[PDB]
Amino acid sequence: GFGGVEGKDILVFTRQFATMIDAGLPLVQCLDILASQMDNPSFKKVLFAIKSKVEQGSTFADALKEHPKVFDELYVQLCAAGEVGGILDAILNRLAAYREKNEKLKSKVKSALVAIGVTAVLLLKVTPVFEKMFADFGSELPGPTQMIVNFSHMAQEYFFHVAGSIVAVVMSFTWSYRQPLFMPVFGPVLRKVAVARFTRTLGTMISSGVPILDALDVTAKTAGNRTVEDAIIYVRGKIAEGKNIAGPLAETKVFPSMVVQMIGVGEATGAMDTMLNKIADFYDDEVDAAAMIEPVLMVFLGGVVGGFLIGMYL
Amino acid sequence: IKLVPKEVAEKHLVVPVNRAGPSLIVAMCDPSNIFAVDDLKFLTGYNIETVVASEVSIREAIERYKGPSLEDIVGDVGDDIEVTKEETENIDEMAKAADDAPVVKLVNLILMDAISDIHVEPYEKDFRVRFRIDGVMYEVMRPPMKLRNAITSRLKIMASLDISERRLPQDGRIKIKMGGGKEMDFRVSVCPTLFGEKVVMRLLDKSNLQLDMTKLGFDAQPLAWFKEAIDRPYGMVLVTGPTGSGKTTTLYSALSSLNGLDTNICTAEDPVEFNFAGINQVQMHDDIGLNFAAALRSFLRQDPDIIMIGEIRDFETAEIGVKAALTGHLVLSTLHTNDAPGTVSRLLNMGIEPFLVTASLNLILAQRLARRLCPACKKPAECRDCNDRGYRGRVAIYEVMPFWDGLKELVINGASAAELKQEAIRLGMSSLRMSGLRKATTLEEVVGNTAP
């Protein structure tokens, strides 16, 4: 018996492979880099073993088959479908987006059938069960009827409470579904997520040995947010013209003073790889902290429960 | 891997082993058997690429498809280099008793996988080598991408470094437990090497030529005695010659031939070439980002009785060298040039003066390659540097020995015993004379007998 790896940790590693492979590095060199940039041993250890099979000439799909407890049949088949069709790059991008959506969805049920499914049944009916069970403590409560009425009339009068229960359900479903003119002012710009991804990708390609300009040309093709893609094309154009990396960044609001000042050190130090790796880890942890997706649950959780109980009493 | 029935593989002793560039790689013991080959062609419907293999190795691979190994691998107490090889081996034997309950002594492969030039250029390319007599030849050893990658990490790791796509090239050194070294260049993936991963190994197996080379008629015994002397009282010498003429060999010969057991010697090379059978010796090699001058500069700093510079090529080190000579160390080195304006020109052009070099340089040998149709001859064409001249042409040189090629003879050309007198007293000078006329091929033994 062996377990997989965390949702976070699959995420980081699938993202960073998709990024390196779409950069045109050799698959074995992609594998080496993410292993060598890893913080947990179990990841660095596996990825050396996956790479060891790839250097014997096996496909990535067949190399991941050595860890079926970590990469399930659906993951390998996605890889292998990409390898068979000549689309390994775009299926890894798909898998990275998949792993990101999976981790975010995990944090965000749990915060405040897997665990998400069992916890989501369990939260969706907790209250409405409470409710039915206070309303089953005997007869002649607030709002009931006597049991001798005809059933249809008894059930229709309680319709109030059947309704307050369904509304309670709809609410906890909404919290679980949501929760996992200046025209340019209205466009979605770069977020925290998109800066964290950028920084990880660049930290990744620099630590591997790619120059800054080669890493930026790859990244400018793999950036999801259009306004950031436009930002990064401008940063790369500025750097390729001979402007200093920290100065192309300083023109764009999305990079704080600390980010620019830290990058500006990294330029003079030949340590940009790592400046970016520490920036990226800082951002990835700020991202996963960012907490209102769990407090607003609980607001609607007990607020609806209490609204039911109040409802019939009155 | 895939064949027709396992039975057919065993009967015909053949085994497919890969599929590449629309062809099935077939390892075959009897490649002259057109019946078997045509049977495989028809049954597979695939075009074949035939590879000859030893019958029992093919049979072994058929039955395995490296198992006993697949388990002995998960034994951390084996790979550990901290453990002496003598004991480690024992574990592998006893652990192997698991299967059949004996000790196998000397599993060739199980050991082969746990415990002068090799060129390994790419994927599915036969290795080439430089043989001590045969030179560049092709070899029966090829590795496909997986095996290449595995070798590549193996060699990288044993040399103490971590090659990866992030750090794809690697220039290290393997330390064979027998204190023997080897220079390893190495590349992972295809990022710098499109032809795939690759490695090269320049083995330090030298067997440095000895003074036994008055066999080869290169230097006369008399002159070698004069140099033996010279090197004992710390006369500094440079070996000059065109390329392929003898410089390094001759140098290494002169140091190797002397008993250097009682003096601290002390060498700076861009790569190893010098072998010496002597104990008081520090060997220093240029590493990434170090100039020759860094190592000499910091080395002269300790107390070398003798300093050997492989060959002067940045003259910022040259300068340190001739400075070492003027302290009064015994310095020796090599220089690419064919006569006296060749060197002096060559030496003066990064800023040492001929007063410092010629004044503190004692002897300059000039080496050659003479051939007469097919004899290949390396001879010391000729030089005693007396000093400088005030108001001059400078470099005062007294030519002791010339080499006449017409008769293949070394002539003395106006050298007198009064020249090589340069001794501190009468007893010293007498010792030089005795070594002059009074003073077994292997270097170890020769050093061993000059030692005495």
Place this chain on the structure above:
Amino acid sequence: LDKSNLQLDMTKLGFDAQPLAWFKEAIDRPYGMVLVTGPTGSGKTTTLYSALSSLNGLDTNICTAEDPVEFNFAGINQVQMHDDIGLNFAAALRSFLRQDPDIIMIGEIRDFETAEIGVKAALTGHLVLSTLHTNDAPGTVSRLLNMGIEPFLVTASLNLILAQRLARRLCPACKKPAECRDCNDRGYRGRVAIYEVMPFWDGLKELVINGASAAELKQEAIRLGMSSLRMSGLRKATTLEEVVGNTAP
């Protein structure tokens, strides 16, 4: 370009005379180092690739460092090396000279920190070859000396320098080797001692020998070696694979 690499079959194109190509064939066998100089698009890279491709390099370890692939060679003992992100040309040459190349090919010298490694490789006694953007002798030498190699090291250890051209006569497109044997340095000097073997007259589209003598190209370790050079001089099928295939023999 259009490529798949031009061969010595290009005495068809009148670029280099067969005699000179034999002299280079020789030259490249005893490891005389050569740089192909020429203005932009005179044929430097093509000519280079032609000279290496035309030789049998099956018995020698060759060994190339390029910023991107351009060099095709039909030879087995060969290591092809390409600049990657964040590597200087010098990183790859520096670490490559380290192994045992009989022949080193540098696509084109453009950081002269690599240039320096290259001419160092020439002085250990490798056979080095490369390309340089320039149109005559002050062009190159100037160009070579300006990141700190001296002409004693380059000119002293550089053997031959070809100069390539584009000649146009209305609509013919002609690429010719305009001309150079580097003898060495001079003590107290102007330095670069150069003996011009072949010039190209454009008026008649002819290659003339200009004061070269057989006593010049003598530079041989001996009699038998020198004799081999002579035979290749006068004694020594368009595709590269086949041409290599037939120089191999």
Place this chain on the structure above:
Amino acid sequence: IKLVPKEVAEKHLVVPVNRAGPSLIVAMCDPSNIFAVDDLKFLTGYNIETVVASEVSIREAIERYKGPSLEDIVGDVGDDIEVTKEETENIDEMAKAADDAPVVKLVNLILMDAISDIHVEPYEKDFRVRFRIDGVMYEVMRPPMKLRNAITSRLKIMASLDISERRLPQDGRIKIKMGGGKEMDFRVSVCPTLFGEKVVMRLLDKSNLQLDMTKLGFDAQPLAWFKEAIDRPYGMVLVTGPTGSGKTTTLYSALSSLNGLDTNICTAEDPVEFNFAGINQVQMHDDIGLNFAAALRSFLRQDPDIIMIGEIRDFETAEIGVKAALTGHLVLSTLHTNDAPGTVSRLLNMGIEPFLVTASLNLILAQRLARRLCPACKKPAECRDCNDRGYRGRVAIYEVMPFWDGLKELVINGASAAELKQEAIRLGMSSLRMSGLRKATTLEEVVGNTAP
């Protein structure tokens, strides 16, 4: 450690003390006793390496018993050099009472691990030394890689520096608490030293050599009188010499020999080496983040009659120094070089001109090491700097004394009494003459008697 029965160890007075390179190290008092040795060989079944020890020391070790050490190590209050050795030792004794409840006085090893030339070349190579009478000899001390590495860090740290694969070579100095010094070259790993880590130590041993060293034939009494003079009227001097010719010793000798009781002297060193038996003296040492120039710059600021700079190595301080010479202080210092282009080159390359140095530098001594087989000789090879020349070659130098090595003699070479005249007058010049011919080994006493 392990033996057969404790009784057998005590009866035969032998004790195993380690196991290394498949052999049992056995400390043995009677190594001629083949019966006892063969008994140990048979009973242990191990191959032996015999080490002779004094009988009572072996007995003491048997009863006392790398373990007691394995625990006393985790005692930070021991390694701390800030603590006086007198007290530190006490802790080690009392802490050792833990095992058997006594005080052991003088654990040789426990102390040996807590509190003229040594050559340590590589892994598993016997150390060599230069003995005061025997010269180059082999030694019974070898360290394998682990022990080498440990020594190497030990020596590195005690000298105040941090050797590592990032900074593999190290040229520092150990300050023995007896104020004594030693030059230490050192290399970690094998990156510069393929033969492994290595170290060299050229021992000083000090308490500082005096003018009593016309015993050692280094400088003639006449010249020392001339320098005595010279230093009294504030002629500035630099001691040049190749590595370990005696620069610092000679310097310290010249300052120490003079009565400096009536003049404010004033020294800036990277570490202490200078001992002076004089009262008006300010000793200044480079600290973290200070350049030599910071201390000289701010020091010249007060009123030193005499300024001593240990050795000029950042020439931004050199510049301050020669500036101090031109205001008219008496400055003195050391420089690594072997002759005149050596220094002048060396001095001019951070931007002092020879008008400023040579014009304001008065005398330059050149020191040497002369070897005649096993004598170790340090001599002043030779220099009066007259000044500069307008339109020139510059540095006008009049060589007063040369040293002939052939006869080991100091010759006067064209110096006249009219040269050293440089006096403000007749009475001053007369005083110089008297000191010339008119003008007890310990420094304290010698200073004491030059004082008078």
